[PDB]
């Protein structure tokens, strides 16, 4: 790998919209990252909790798991997690901030509810 690989992975991970939008625009065009070796697989919100209403959160679920098993093949899961995990609650909540009044609280607790359950079982 490129000796900036880190530095890569970790501007892609970061809880601001600037690092996921990087992110989302690398996830575009995942050849021209070829030379990183970059894991890009997904389940998407598979084994989450329960999303009754529907509030689309695969987008991410997506990055989750992109910071999960890239860190993981790093070596460097354990120090990272709980940054991934808040990144993770904060694509959440950009995703509920399309909805107002009574959805909004219904899709801040959803997203609360899957922040929770990988903090905890992850
Ligand atoms: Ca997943």
Redesign the pocket.
Do not use: A, F, V
């Given at each position: 790998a490129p000796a900036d690989k880190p530095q890569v992975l970790a501007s892609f991970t970061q809880t601001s919209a600037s690092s996921q939008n990087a992110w989302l625009a690398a996830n575009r065009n995942q050849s021209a990252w070829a030379a990183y070796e970059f894991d890009w697989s997904?389940?998407?919100?598979?084994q989450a909790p329960d999303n009754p209403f529907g509030f689309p959160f695969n987008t991410a679920?997506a990055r989750?798991?992109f910071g999960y098993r890239n860190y993981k093949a790093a070596g460097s899961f354990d120090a990272n997690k709980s940054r991934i995990d808040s990144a993770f609650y904060e694509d959440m909540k950009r995703v509920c901030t399309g909805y107002t009044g009574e959805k909004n609280t219904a899709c801040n607790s959803t997203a609360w509810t899957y922040y929770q359950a990988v903090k905890i079982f992850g």
């Open positions: 997904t389940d998407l919100c598979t679920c989750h798991d």
